[PDB]
Every structure is written in C-alpha cells, then in structure tokens.
Design a protein around this ligand. Structure first.
Ligand SMILES: [K+]
Ligand SMILES: [K+]
Ligand SMILES: [Mg+2]
Ligand SMILES: [Mg+2]
Ligand SMILES: [Mg+2]
Ligand SMILES: [Mg+2]
Ligand SMILES: [Mg+2]
Ligand SMILES: [Mg+2]
Ligand SMILES: [Mg+2]
Ligand SMILES: [Mg+2]
Ligand SMILES: [Mg+2]
Ligand SMILES: [Mg+2]
Ligand SMILES: [Mg+2]
Ligand SMILES: [Mg+2]
Ligand SMILES: [Mg+2]
Ligand SMILES: [Mg+2]
Lengths: 107, 56, 46, 179, 74
RNA sequence: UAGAUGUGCAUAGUUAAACCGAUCAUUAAAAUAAUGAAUAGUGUCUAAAGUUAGACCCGAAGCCUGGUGA
RNA sequence: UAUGAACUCUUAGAGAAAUUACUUAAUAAACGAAGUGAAUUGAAAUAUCUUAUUAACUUCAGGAAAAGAAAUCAAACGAGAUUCUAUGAUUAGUGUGAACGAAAAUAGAGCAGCCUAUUAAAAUAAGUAAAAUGGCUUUAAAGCUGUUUGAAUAUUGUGGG
C-alpha cells in the first residue's frame, strides 16, 4: 500500500522539478533492466547533460547549456529542499562537488 | 483590409535563407513532439528517493 | 505709444494669417490648436 | 543613384526610396507594382543619410571640443568616413553604385564580396544593412545565381526542393502583349 | 623606434585564378593591396578572397600565404 | 508549537593608521623618563535651534529655450 | 436585458474649419523610449565644476511603455532576472573648492519562468571582443562612441569580469 503514497510524493513536487525530471530522467528512476543509451528522451538526445556545453557536430561551435549557472543553482537549491538532488546530473553547483573540490584541492 | 495587413507583415518570408528556413521548420517538428510524460512506474521510484531523504 | 495698426484691416488677411486652415496644415499650427484645445478655448482660430 | 542596367534581367536595381520603376518599354498590366518586403528593423530615426547607403552601425556622433588649458567644453560632431564607390556584384554582374563607409568596405573584403555581405542572416548584419542594404539583398535574391545557390543549400539541410518568379512574370507580360 | 607606431593594413589574402603576370601563378595565395583586388581582379574574375571558409574547403591552412612575385612571367 | 528574522546608538580607549589594548601614541632597540588622552547610555514628548530644501514676507534690470507677429 | 433614430466640422480632395464637392472617407492632451540639449543659479567674482543625462524640442510607440531570467554581484562563505519604495548614505569615493555621489546588503510592494519562448524567434553569433587616438560617462575599471587597426574556441581551464 506504500506504493500509492510514493507517487503522491513525486506528484507533490513543484512543477518546475517534475518538468525537468520528465525530460531528463536519470538512469536511477528508469526501469530495472533499462539501458540509458536507448529510448533516450528527445531532450536527452539533443543534450546528454543540459548543464554542460555541447559542441555542435556540423558547426564547430559550442552551444551554451540549456540551463545557465544561475538556473543550475536554483534547481540544486529547489531539488535539495525536496530531497531529490540525487537525480540531477553532474553540476559544479552541487553541494557535494562544491565541497569535494575544496577538500581535495583546497585553497 | 486585415488579411492584406497580416499577409503584408508576413511578406518577408520569401527573403529567408536556407538556414533560416531550416531552423523554422525544426520548431514545427519539435513542438509536435510534446512534453515527455512521467510513468507512475517512475513516479514510484522518485518517491522512494524523497521518502529516504526526508524521514529515512 | 500705441498706434492705430488695425486701420484699413481686411478680414481676408485674418483668415489667411490666423485662420483654422493656416494651422491644421502646418507643424507649428497643430501645437497652437492642441495648446488652445488643452486649455479649453472655444475660439481655436480667428 | 544612377545604377547600370543588369545584363539579362529586366528588374532594375531598386531606388533608394524602395521603388522599382520599370521602363515603359516593358509591358505591364496596370495597377501592378514591385513591392519590396519592409525592413524588419524599420528605418533609422536619426541620420536619415544612412537610410540610403551601406553605413553599417556608424551614425553621426556628438561630443565636446575640449580646450588645452581650461578644458572648456564646446559641442561638435563626428561624421563617419562615407564614400561613394562602385562595388562589383557577381550575381548581378554589374557595378552597384552606393555610398559605403571605409569600415564596411573592409567587411566586404572579409566576407568575400558585396553579395556575401548582403546575404548574411545574423542579426548584427541585418541591422548594419539598413533599408538600402535590404533592397540590394532583395535584388540579388531574384537573380538565377542566388536562386540556384539557395536551392542547392536546401538539399544539404534536408529541405524539400522549392512559386512563380518575378523575372518570368515580366516575361509573361511581353508575350501577353503580343497576343 | 618606439613602443607604439601607426597602425597599417598589410593587405587582403587572395588566391589567383588566371595566372596574372608579374604577380603570381595560378592558384597562388598571397596578400595584395585591397584596391587592386577590389577594382581590377575581382570584377574580372582573376582572383578570389581567401575567407576562413575557403581555407577549409581547399584543405590548406593560414600558413600557406606566399608573397607577390614581381619577377614572374607567363 | 518551535526556531530564526528586521537600520541604528552605547558598552574601551589609543594613533595618521593598523598591530596593540586599560592601556595606547612619539623616542629609527626597548625599557613608569616625560607628555597627551579614561568611567551611563538610549527612546519619547514639549520647546528652542544648526544644515539642505522657496526657507520670514514683498521687489529687479537681465540670461537661456520653445513659440507668435511684416 | 434588448432595441429605432442619432445632423455639420475637426476627419476624402480642395478651400478663408462647420463650405464646396463627394462618400457606408474617421483617434486630442498627459504619461513612455531614443536622439538633441541650454541658461538663470551656486561657488559670495569667475573659466573646470555646479545648475543638469534638468527644462525644452524632434522622432517613434502602447494602454501602459521601457526593462528583464546574468559574459550579474560577491570574496574564499555565498547570493541568484526586471521594475517600484525605504534604509545602507550629508558613506566609500571624486573634486583646488563649492558641491556632487554609488554599489553590496536589508525591509516592503509584486513574484514566473523560458527557447516546444503559449505564438510562433538561434543551426549559440567576427570587422565582433579588444587596442591606439578624439570624446562621453566615470574614481583610472566597466559601459557608450567617430577614426585607423584587429582575437580566441569551453572546467581535459577557451573567452569576459
Ligand atoms: K571665488
Ligand atoms: K569623503
Ligand atoms: Mg512701437
Ligand atoms: Mg494698410
Ligand atoms: Mg543625414
Ligand atoms: Mg595603406
Ligand atoms: Mg571603539
Ligand atoms: Mg503692409
Ligand atoms: Mg468633409
Ligand atoms: Mg480635408
Ligand atoms: Mg538608493
Ligand atoms: Mg555566446
Ligand atoms: Mg569596443
Ligand atoms: Mg581589465
Ligand atoms: Mg574603459
Ligand atoms: Mg568587455
């Protein structure tokens, strides 16, 4: 019976988060035997990581990330308030990576 | 008098370059894809992460 | 002192120099009307 | 300006006013005009001289004439280095006369010619073209060289091949006048 | 000598197409005065501007720019 | 319910200033040698005031900008 | 809650507006943005300065407009678009002086994000960034700009600050 309330928790998240997870779903929430390489979302096919820049294959030019560093910090701050920060892709704004880079390298 | 005005403001569509026509055509195909939907199978897996990070 | 400058004054020059059409048909005359209209004047010209 | 006659085209180089007056030698059905699509960014509200030439982003600028001892300020102007040149157009095949600045002359050599300077789609370039440069852009689009170039670039982008042309419409009026 | 001098233009890069005498052989890349290329060569289709895109299509690099040969003869 | 939140002033002085600190500054090293500087604030009302705004009141000739009139 | 009628001029063209002659001809001001841009005045005179990105004029535009989702600020912690009000602040700072004068941050009014923009737009930006010089702004930076010149390709450290 605890599965009917789990979906209610995912449906209670803000629309700004549900939208992002819908188009950039991590491999963790995908089916058990699913392969991340296949059945990629149309958004994921355009950009595996929306927070990193991508070099267009045809034209040798880097495309800005779909979410700027300012918007990347708003998702990490909004995702950390609902305990879903483990679903966002790699980001320099992650609270862990920000802290790992300091302990590793320091000042 | 209104159709001759809207058609006039849309008269520059014949001066578009092949790239400008290619980008405009991708929006029609992209906008038709819609927004991906989250299966209740995936929502159940998302709730597990929420519950585990709120109550344990 | 003042002079009788309106002696022999014709009403054809009044219409040409201070008439309504001398103003709607000029850039500076549209201001006079708009100015006099904002003040509420009934006599906009001549 | 007084533009040359295009070798094998009845469409003359447009007037700076935007009109395309055809010679009476060309039979045309009455109530017919060649209207150029309006400039997307509209005319330039100041320095109307630039609405009839390739001035780029250069306008007339106002500043101060600063003295040497007391630094007294007096208003002056800074005018762009405008010149009248005859630029070659490969598509048209003639010398298009126009007023162009020395900075826009270097850009012409940088892009590969006048035609390559007018066909640019970047926003920064369409603003530099202006009303006049937008008319030359429209004229070269009617030429067969640019038409076959865009028809070939649509195959590389996976676009379907591409109604009636404006040069044939004028051709249809001369055969219609014979009947 | 000084630390700052008058800024000058060294010319425009162009590739010959008609084997112009006194300048270079056919398909010769070098810098030429902007006036000669703009008024004489380009209208007559004797040369072409070497834009960055032109360098890629021809496979050459920017390090292939030669010099004018005043002693060249057909 | 609980936690946090919202200018400011004072509580420590000293010097050009920091370190320093019931001590501090000058003496090109420092050292009671001398000299100078140390102890209730804060808010409100009433009233008189300093400053900036027309600033207790009335009064120029003139300067600039936009318009009007042969 | 529906409904008949509702003349002439501003307002077809002309002209001495409310006429002519025709016809199912028709849109003020204030506010907004850019451009241009003073002087009285103060400094007990007066040139830099102040007055003042003021008044005014010109263009263009809508019921609002403009602006706007960081090549932004911070300082080794972090904040997270724009707009409006207050504090910060007779502050930092500039200037011989007279005077001029921020931002971070905080509080409140609102709160909305995006490119598949809820109206149809990018194949991620080159004569551009930037430099010298002449000016504007200003604290010398950043930003704006005439003239002459003129780059690079992403945190596997490329570009701006
Ligand atoms: K004085
Ligand atoms: K000060
Ligand atoms: Mg007199
Ligand atoms: Mg008389
Ligand atoms: Mg002009
Ligand atoms: Mg030279
Ligand atoms: Mg103290
Ligand atoms: Mg007389
Ligand atoms: Mg009428
Ligand atoms: Mg009329
Ligand atoms: Mg303030
Ligand atoms: Mg970019
Ligand atoms: Mg610059
Ligand atoms: Mg710097
Ligand atoms: Mg600077
Ligand atoms: Mg910069």
């Amino acid at each position: 019976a605890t599965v009917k309330q789990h979906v209610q928790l995912a449906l209670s998240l803000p629309p700004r988060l549900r939208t992002f997870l819908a188009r950039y779903p991590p491999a963790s929430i995908l089916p058990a035997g699913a392969d991340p390489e296949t059945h990629k979302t149309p958004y994921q096919e355009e950009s595996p990581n929306p927070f990193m820049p991508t070099k267009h294959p045809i034209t040798g030019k880097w495309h800005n990330p779909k979410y700027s560093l300012r918007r990347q910090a708003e998702l990490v701050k909004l995702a950390q308030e609902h305990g879903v920060e483990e679903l966002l892709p790699f980001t320099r704004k992650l609270n862990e990576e920000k802290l790992r880079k300091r302990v590793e390298l320091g000042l | 008098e209104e159709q001759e005005k809207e058609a006039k403001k849309s008269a520059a569509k014949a001066m578009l370059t092949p790239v400008q026509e290619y980008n405009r055509k991708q929006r029609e195909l992209r906008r038709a894809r819609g927004q991906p939907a989250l299966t209740e199978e995936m929502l159940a897996k998302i709730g597990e992460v929420v519950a585990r990070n709120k109550l344990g | 002192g003042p002079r009788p400058t309106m002696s022999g004054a014709t009403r054809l020059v009044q219409k040409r120099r201070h008439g309504f059409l001398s103003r709607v048909k000029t850039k500076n005359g549209q201001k006079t009307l708009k100015r006099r209209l904002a003040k509420g004047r009934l006599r906009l010209s001549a | 300006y007084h533009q040359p006659r295009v070798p094998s085209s009845a469409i003359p180089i447009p007037n700076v006013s935007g009109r395309v007056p055809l010679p009476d030698s060309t039979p045309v059905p009455e109530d017919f005009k060649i209207e150029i699509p309006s400039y997307p960014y509209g005319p330039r509200r100041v320095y109307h001289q630039s609405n009839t030439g390739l001035y780029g982003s250069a306008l007339i600028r106002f500043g101060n004439n600063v003295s040497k001892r007391n630094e007294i300020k007096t208003r002056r102007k800074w005018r762009p280095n405008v010149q009248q040149k005859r630029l070659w157009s490969k598509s048209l095949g003639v010398f298009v006369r126009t007023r162009v600045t020395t900075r826009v002359l270097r850009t012409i050599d940088k892009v590969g010619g006048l035609d390559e300077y007018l066909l640019g789609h970047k926003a920064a370039r369409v603003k530099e073209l202006g009303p006049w440069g937008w008319m030359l852009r429209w004229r070269i689009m009617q030429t067969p060289e640019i038409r076959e170039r865009f028809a070939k670039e649509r195959e590389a982008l996976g676009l379907p091949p591409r109604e009636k042309s404006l040069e044939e419409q004028l051709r249809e009026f001369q055969v219609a006048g014979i009947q | 000598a000084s630390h700052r001098m008058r800024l000058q233009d060294q010319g425009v890069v162009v590739r010959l197409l008609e084997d112009i005498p006194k300048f270079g052989r056919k398909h010769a890349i070098f810098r030429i005065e902007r006036g000669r290329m703009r008024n004489e060569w380009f209208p007559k289709n004797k040369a072409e501007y070497m834009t960055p895109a032109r360098f890629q299509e021809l496979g050459l690099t920017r390090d292939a720019i030669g010099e004018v040969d005043r002693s060249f003869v057909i």
